[PDB]
Amino acid sequence: ERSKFGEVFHINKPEYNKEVTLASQGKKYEGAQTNDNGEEDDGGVYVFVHLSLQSKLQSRILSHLFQSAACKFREIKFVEIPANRAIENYPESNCPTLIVYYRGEVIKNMITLLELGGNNSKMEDFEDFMVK
Amino acid sequence: FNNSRSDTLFLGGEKISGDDIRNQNVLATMAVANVVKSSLGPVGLDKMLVDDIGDFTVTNDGATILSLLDVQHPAGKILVELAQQQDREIGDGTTSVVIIASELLKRANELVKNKIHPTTIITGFRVALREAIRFINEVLSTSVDTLGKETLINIAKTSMSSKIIGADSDFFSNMVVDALLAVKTQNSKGEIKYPVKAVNVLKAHGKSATESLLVPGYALNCTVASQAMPKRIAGGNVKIACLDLNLQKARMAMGVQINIDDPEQLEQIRKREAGIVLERVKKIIDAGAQVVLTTKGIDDLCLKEFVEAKIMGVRRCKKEDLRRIARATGATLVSSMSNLEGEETFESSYLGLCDEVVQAKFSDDECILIKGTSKHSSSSIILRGANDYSLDEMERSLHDSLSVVKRTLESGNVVPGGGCVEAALNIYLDNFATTVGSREQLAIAEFAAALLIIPKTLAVNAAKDSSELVAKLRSYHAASQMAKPEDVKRRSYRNYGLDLIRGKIVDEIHAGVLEPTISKVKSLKSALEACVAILRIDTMITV
Amino acid sequence: ERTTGRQAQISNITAAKAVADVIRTCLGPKAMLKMLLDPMGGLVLTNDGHAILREIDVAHPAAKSMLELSRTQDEEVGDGTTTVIILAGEILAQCAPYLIEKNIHPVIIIQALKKALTDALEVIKQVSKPVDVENDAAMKKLIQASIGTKYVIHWSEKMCELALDAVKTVRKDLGQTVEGEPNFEIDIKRYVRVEKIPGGDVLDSRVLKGVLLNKDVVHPKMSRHIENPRVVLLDCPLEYKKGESQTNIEIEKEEDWNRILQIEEEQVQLMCEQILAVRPTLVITEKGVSDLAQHYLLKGGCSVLRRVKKSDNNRIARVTGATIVNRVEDLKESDVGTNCGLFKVEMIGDEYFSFLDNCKEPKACTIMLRGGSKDILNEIDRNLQDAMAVARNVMLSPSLSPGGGATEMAVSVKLAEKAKQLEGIQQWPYQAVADAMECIPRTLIQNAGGDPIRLLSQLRAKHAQGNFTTGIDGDKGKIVDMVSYGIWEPEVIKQQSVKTAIESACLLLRVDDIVSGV
Amino acid sequence: LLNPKAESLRRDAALKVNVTSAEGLQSVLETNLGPKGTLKMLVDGAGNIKLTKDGKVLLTEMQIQSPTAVLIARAAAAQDEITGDGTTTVVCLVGELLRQAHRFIQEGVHPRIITDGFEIARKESMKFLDEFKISKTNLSNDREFLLQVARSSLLTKVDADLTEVLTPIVTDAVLSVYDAQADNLDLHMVEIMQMQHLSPKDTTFIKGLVLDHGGRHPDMPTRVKNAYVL
Amino acid sequence: KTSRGEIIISNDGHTILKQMAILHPVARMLVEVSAAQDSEAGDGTTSVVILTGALLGAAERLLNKGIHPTIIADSFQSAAKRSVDILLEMCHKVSLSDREQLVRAASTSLSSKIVSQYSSFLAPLAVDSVLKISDENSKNVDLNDIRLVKKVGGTIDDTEMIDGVVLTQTAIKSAGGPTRKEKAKIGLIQFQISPPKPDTENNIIVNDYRQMDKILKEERAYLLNICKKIKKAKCNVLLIQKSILRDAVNDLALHFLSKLNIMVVKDIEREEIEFLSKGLGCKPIADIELFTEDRLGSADLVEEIDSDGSKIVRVTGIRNNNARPTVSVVIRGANNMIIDETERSLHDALCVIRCLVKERGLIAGGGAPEIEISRRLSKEARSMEGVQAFIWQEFASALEVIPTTLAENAGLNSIKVVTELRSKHENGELNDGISVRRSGTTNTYEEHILQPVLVSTSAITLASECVKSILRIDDIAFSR
């Protein structure tokens, strides 16, 4: 506890840096607080950001894998933004893209995720990633 | 094609009507028929379904295919809803319903092209459906020719054809058929239904498979607790006392715990606790019982009286088994001895008579056999074979065969399958149409011809020449019906179907291809309902 | 969306042929290399069939099914990863003209394929030769084939012995008419995992007839050697227990906090007495065990192990027979795991040990592997896994079949001879299977750089008129006697490959359409 | 017999592509072999230009598009981590061997036969290398041989004018760290420093260490003789 | 198919027109005509549209002959007046005081529904429900004042009229709920009984235990004062509108009301309040400050009726001038389908009875009146002169569209049916028409196929008005 998220959240462009930026926090009683600084001494939330295009194979496969992870990894935040609404001129050549944030900072930039494990990606390929 | 962008009638979306809609609906139904065709009959071929992600599944189950099939058409989804309703009501045969509906819609469209109004087609099809229902009722039969004849024996052999037991099916089928036929009963309120669970299976390594025995009685899956009691008592005449009241050592009080250090007081408390059960046991011994069956178990201390009295006690007995044994032996399971203000078993009032009761040793768990009841009509199957692996395989095969034969028996009103109904209805409706006219003859004839799709599809799925088999089936049915007015038949008989394994026309009643009347009636009625619903759509608007 | 007619069958057959052709060159010691090009700039020249079939992406569902079959066989059987796909593809290609040109219904082809599978199994049994599974020398010689010419070539001599000893420890040779033939019930994945012990040499490795536990005594004042061990397994922890619903502790005086400790002592003492009622010698609890529980159990004259993973208990119940009870109060006298060998904890290589072996046959064991470095240990573990898989294949049937394609050629010849006398429409698929069986010798000839036609014809003539032990030499590339050159493969691998390939071909032929659906 | 979003080479197309890539790489690295070779000009796009001749550096810095060329370059790069030289030799040998193998294959020779012949020739070449080498003496007065070796190494990389400067510097630097004894050799004992605004020929050898930081007072002595270091 | 992806299949003209999303402004006149027919007649929305189309075709043909649209409209109006007169002449009059005729008409209307064998009870139910408010010689009576209350449970035979008004919500089932009260006054409350809940920013600030106690006492006092104010107005039945922001009746408020002998009913929707505004004759109360006796109703007794699980609150004996006998028929049934079908059947019966009340009498169905009127108008138009004769002939020809459509939809020979009807009408009068039961032309009157005359009269009038409106539009312009 806390069982904070439990599902994949939709992101609109105006709130991208709110929902992703908000990786930089814990909550009350999840860490030490000090004089004139209420921030937890520990790290923040792992946020898995999916930049998707509905037309692409891997995007469809990942929508399944991301929600399936969300159902078990209750403490991990999973979000999805249409790729075309995240990056101006998002190129199809990078599609799909996964960026992993932590404590407000960028941890992974995985591009054309069809090669991140099997072409027919299984939860085994995604759970092997999530533990790295 | 693709009629759209009308120059007039500016509405909120595109609109079409008439022959275009009729042709589109016919094409959609033909597309669905193409998907469901290969799944008809036991010899059908598997089809693979692929999603938008990349996963796929393979199966020949028509219901599953239709449930997972992606159909995007206002008229196409009618067939999917039809199949779902049939699965809810019948649970099987959706492929035949869909094929019949598609053929009926195609023939109705052909009639429409022949200047036949849709309403006339619907009326004629409904008249044909009513006549077909009447004929089906006329050709119904109950569970007959099942004892002493190869009717359910072939069913068991077919179910056993895919298992090791197939080699000795010639005998195991007879065993299972006799076991399930004997247990015929009215069930509840004259429902006329065979028991849901019956015919226990046992394993043995003696002799061979052909020596498998049918126990003339019941069997209990438990032990006799202490080994000091005889395993077989009173071979000439053995009585069984069935009691539900527990014989386990009772407590002085439910809410009082015994913490006593005085030997005398401990002895008194133990004497009372053991004496309650000893009196309960004595109420059975005084009745002259030789075997005691207790559902809630028997304690070791109270078994001393039985051991001295040479009475075999049984613990952890099943309530249903004891009730059945008591009823078959003329006794009744005693729910409790606390009648009014007394405590007794009514000696000689609830004791059943049996010819022989013996603890029989078998593979894995042992059991106690109760044989020689006054009227039980049940039996247990003892499996014999070369080794334990064969015995277990035969046990599973016997379970499957009993399940299928019980399903067949429970249907007290069945009709021959394998295309018999379809061909007979085709011939009957062809004859009937020649006496109606009034613009309904064409519709009735087309409806009759529609039913011929099922036998044709079955023959095609059998890798045989469908034309020849269907023609022979039609000739046999016509010959059978033509002799009806003469009230004499020597070579003309009905109930002939299509053998999809040997590619021959055989009597399905003897072969073992029968289906319940409700299944066929609902299939035909729902197929016609779906066809009518599709035909009633002559305008489509997409906003 | 929808495919009707022969088009779907043609598509499936083409997909199968495309899958097969890629690995067609993966057989034999002369197997050619392949280039795998990722969308990025990286690439490899790996020649491993499993790697080729794993890193290759196929869009057609039939190709995906074939790849899944090969991947499954890669673990179900120790060999035949590429043979199955090649054989299935060749059979499908041979049967294609009958379905397309001869207008033969798929059902006839499937039935004929099943009959040809039965005939091929019979022929494989006929041509196989027996082996001495009881003499260690023959087993070592046979298993050295899959151990030599590898990183473990240096220790092959002891590697063969270690693998054979482990397999025999897990092998149960029993035959009777009561329980049937167990088929040796050999399980390597679960109850043969190798324990890597740093230090020592391969020759120092030993096979433990039981389960080895790395959990040391939870308290120094505990027995480390029991000559009459008895194992009892429990799950519920031995510590302070709260109520099922919300539990609150209210203490007024500071000294009254000892009430919780007193309650814990009482509960732990009761649980320990219940455990000791069964005369145990070692208490294993999956959950945590309090110090008071350890003291109480020690007072009873038994050892205690706490926080033991379920993986250890799963094998302990197999090698010791101890029954695990979730609740301590429900423990029964019959749950005690009697017939246990020892609790010796002798340390090897500065590592903690706990041996639970015995002179029984629990179909489970542990391999105590030693080595001079971690890399050596890992390589030896992988090679031992491969060698034990090969030994399991050999011992599951005390016979072997000639290699170099001799078995396939003999099967083809016998199948053709039998099909000549069937006198039925099914004769065509039997001949198709017989011709497709020739794929292996064709691949061997092509990889050897010989004549793909003349050499195959000579081999077929030799099989028809001579013995069935003639095959293709890996190095010379000529037709030679397999027995003389010591070229052999286990019969189990051949039988499984043929069965799986024919079954896969039948399953693919059954599918006559692919439709969209979710 | 293909799948979407994929491309494959059939028949002998793969062999032809590999041979062409190897020939291209050889021609790229053909001109820089030997003291009479040329230099390659590399532009990173940020304004930095590198004029390099060493094969290892050229392969590492230069981008390669042909996958076969990438594999060849990566395989040849192993020379740097083992011997430190011969990358160009490896590339040229691979290119010519592939040329000859392709020429024979056009005549119908199977690739496996060529591979076996190459292995046999490799064994024979190892035997010839063993029989052909010359054993160097352990004399401490071998400074002349070290100078010759340094000159041979430098002439391949320099314009033949800086050789006179670098040969003695390299020889002395290597000899000072490794005395005439078994012990061991570690090039980390030789420090490498760079200075700007100086002539290329100014390169010199320093027996000891040079400190980056200097004095910050005009009265400190410019030179100190026999100083005690604190 | 709607823009939301839902697929709607139905042969009802009203639903088809609504879902068609007609964009042409003039074509929406057909939707308006259908709505008017539903409001007045309640049936025949297809017939009015067909007549409008036929009249439009006739007008187009007349225009092709060089006739100005205004003359077309005037002549169509005259022909419609004459046709209405002819139709009224042949109508078979009935009396609202004769329950037998109304019951027969209701049974005939209900025969088209699945519930047929139980029509012997549904027909008299609707007849009595309408008669209790229409009596005789009441001219037009609006059936919308009749409320159909559905409740799960019972069977088809279980029904009740309640001459007063029926509420759809149950009484408080918790402690203190009287479940009934005699000599009760019923008022409509729009507010909720809860502690102070300002709509703007608000909060409770506590700095001491005494402050918390004072706040709690103030909240309880406010609840008690609200309950006492409700009681002082003599409102013995409390009807609280459903709300999700404020508790309808707090537990303390419930106890206070129980001590005050006030019947409490909550979870009331807006539709029920609107219906009770006329059923009870009272007025809504915006806030407790405006809660007084003048805003309350009256009733002899209000109680919850539970015979076989009905659990329905009813109000009887209002005896208020503003209140009217808005009969609320109670519909019961174990299955939801039973109650839905009963509601639809009763609505159809009420529409038929309303058509009878507005214009007493029925006419033969199957297009017989259309054929007879067409023949009479064709015969009479021969005496006319000028453009009027041509327009009357065209109108008479167009009138035969309805029988032609009926014949075509029935699968009968289109041309032959019209000739058979015309030949038969030479001897009979409003007796022979198209019947789907006989698949041909038969004596509809003897077949009990009867339709109210008002349906045909309103159809003719609406078709005439629609064609006049369509022809009167001569230009289209944009306005924004």
PDB file of N, CA, C and O in Angstrom, chain A residues 1 14 18 33-34 36 42 44 51 53 59 63 75 83 119-120 126:
ATOM      1  N   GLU A   1       0.803  -1.227   0.000  1.00  0.00           N
ATOM      2  CA  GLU A   1       0.000   0.000   0.000  1.00  0.00           C
ATOM      3  C   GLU A   1       0.842   1.287   0.000  1.00  0.00           C
ATOM      4  O   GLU A   1       1.947   1.309   0.538  1.00  0.00           O
ATOM      5  N   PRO A  14      -2.456  18.829 -23.121  1.00  0.00           N
ATOM      6  CA  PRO A  14      -2.378  19.820 -22.067  1.00  0.00           C
ATOM      7  C   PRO A  14      -1.979  19.273 -20.709  1.00  0.00           C
ATOM      8  O   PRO A  14      -1.483  20.037 -19.875  1.00  0.00           O
ATOM      9  N   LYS A  18       1.838  17.024 -16.625  1.00  0.00           N
ATOM     10  CA  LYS A  18       1.247  17.041 -15.294  1.00  0.00           C
ATOM     11  C   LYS A  18       1.180  15.603 -14.814  1.00  0.00           C
ATOM     12  O   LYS A  18       2.205  15.232 -14.261  1.00  0.00           O
ATOM     13  N   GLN A  33      10.352  13.209   5.904  1.00  0.00           N
ATOM     14  CA  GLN A  33      10.135  14.609   5.544  1.00  0.00           C
ATOM     15  C   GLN A  33      11.038  15.411   6.476  1.00  0.00           C
ATOM     16  O   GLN A  33      11.347  14.930   7.570  1.00  0.00           O
ATOM     17  N   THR A  34      11.441  16.619   6.087  1.00  0.00           N
ATOM     18  CA  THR A  34      12.311  17.430   6.945  1.00  0.00           C
ATOM     19  C   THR A  34      12.010  18.923   6.986  1.00  0.00           C
ATOM     20  O   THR A  34      10.987  19.393   6.472  1.00  0.00           O
ATOM     21  N   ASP A  36      11.527  22.529   6.354  1.00  0.00           N
ATOM     22  CA  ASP A  36      11.209  23.315   5.175  1.00  0.00           C
ATOM     23  C   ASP A  36      11.389  22.513   3.886  1.00  0.00           C
ATOM     24  O   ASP A  36      11.758  23.068   2.845  1.00  0.00           O
ATOM     25  N   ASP A  42      12.878   9.279  -0.345  1.00  0.00           N
ATOM     26  CA  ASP A  42      12.936   8.192  -1.302  1.00  0.00           C
ATOM     27  C   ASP A  42      12.582   8.694  -2.702  1.00  0.00           C
ATOM     28  O   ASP A  42      12.325   9.882  -2.908  1.00  0.00           O
ATOM     29  N   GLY A  44      10.338   8.421  -6.512  1.00  0.00           N
ATOM     30  CA  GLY A  44       8.962   8.730  -6.884  1.00  0.00           C
ATOM     31  C   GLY A  44       8.306   7.509  -7.501  1.00  0.00           C
ATOM     32  O   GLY A  44       8.606   6.370  -7.113  1.00  0.00           O
ATOM     33  N   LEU A  51       3.344   5.987 -26.342  1.00  0.00           N
ATOM     34  CA  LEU A  51       2.998   6.826 -27.471  1.00  0.00           C
ATOM     35  C   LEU A  51       2.563   5.888 -28.583  1.00  0.00           C
ATOM     36  O   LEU A  51       3.378   5.204 -29.222  1.00  0.00           O
ATOM     37  N   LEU A  53      -0.015   4.556 -32.003  1.00  0.00           N
ATOM     38  CA  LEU A  53      -0.834   4.829 -33.176  1.00  0.00           C
ATOM     39  C   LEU A  53      -1.723   3.602 -33.377  1.00  0.00           C
ATOM     40  O   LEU A  53      -1.241   2.478 -33.453  1.00  0.00           O
ATOM     41  N   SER A  59       1.324  -1.370 -31.454  1.00  0.00           N
ATOM     42  CA  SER A  59       0.511  -0.499 -30.623  1.00  0.00           C
ATOM     43  C   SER A  59      -0.687  -1.256 -30.089  1.00  0.00           C
ATOM     44  O   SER A  59      -1.038  -1.121 -28.914  1.00  0.00           O
ATOM     45  N   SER A  63      -1.336  -2.225 -26.174  1.00  0.00           N
ATOM     46  CA  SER A  63      -2.479  -1.772 -25.394  1.00  0.00           C
ATOM     47  C   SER A  63      -2.921  -2.929 -24.489  1.00  0.00           C
ATOM     48  O   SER A  63      -3.154  -2.739 -23.280  1.00  0.00           O
ATOM     49  N   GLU A  75       0.863  -0.526  -8.114  1.00  0.00           N
ATOM     50  CA  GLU A  75       1.687   0.600  -7.703  1.00  0.00           C
ATOM     51  C   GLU A  75       2.406   1.322  -8.852  1.00  0.00           C
ATOM     52  O   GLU A  75       3.053   2.348  -8.625  1.00  0.00           O
ATOM     53  N   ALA A  83       0.226   9.132 -30.101  1.00  0.00           N
ATOM     54  CA  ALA A  83       1.543   9.658 -30.386  1.00  0.00           C
ATOM     55  C   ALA A  83       1.488  10.970 -31.133  1.00  0.00           C
ATOM     56  O   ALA A  83       2.270  11.889 -30.874  1.00  0.00           O
ATOM     57  N   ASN A 119       8.212 -10.262 -31.632  1.00  0.00           N
ATOM     58  CA  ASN A 119       7.332  -9.466 -32.514  1.00  0.00           C
ATOM     59  C   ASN A 119       5.893  -9.659 -31.986  1.00  0.00           C
ATOM     60  O   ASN A 119       5.065  -8.731 -31.921  1.00  0.00           O
ATOM     61  N   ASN A 120       5.581 -10.902 -31.639  1.00  0.00           N
ATOM     62  CA  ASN A 120       4.327 -11.150 -30.949  1.00  0.00           C
ATOM     63  C   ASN A 120       4.493 -11.123 -29.436  1.00  0.00           C
ATOM     64  O   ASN A 120       4.343 -12.138 -28.752  1.00  0.00           O
ATOM     65  N   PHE A 126       7.219  -8.235 -21.567  1.00  0.00           N
ATOM     66  CA  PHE A 126       6.978  -6.951 -20.858  1.00  0.00           C
ATOM     67  C   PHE A 126       7.371  -7.062 -19.332  1.00  0.00           C
ATOM     68  O   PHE A 126       8.045  -6.164 -18.779  1.00  0.00           O
TER      69      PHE A 126
END
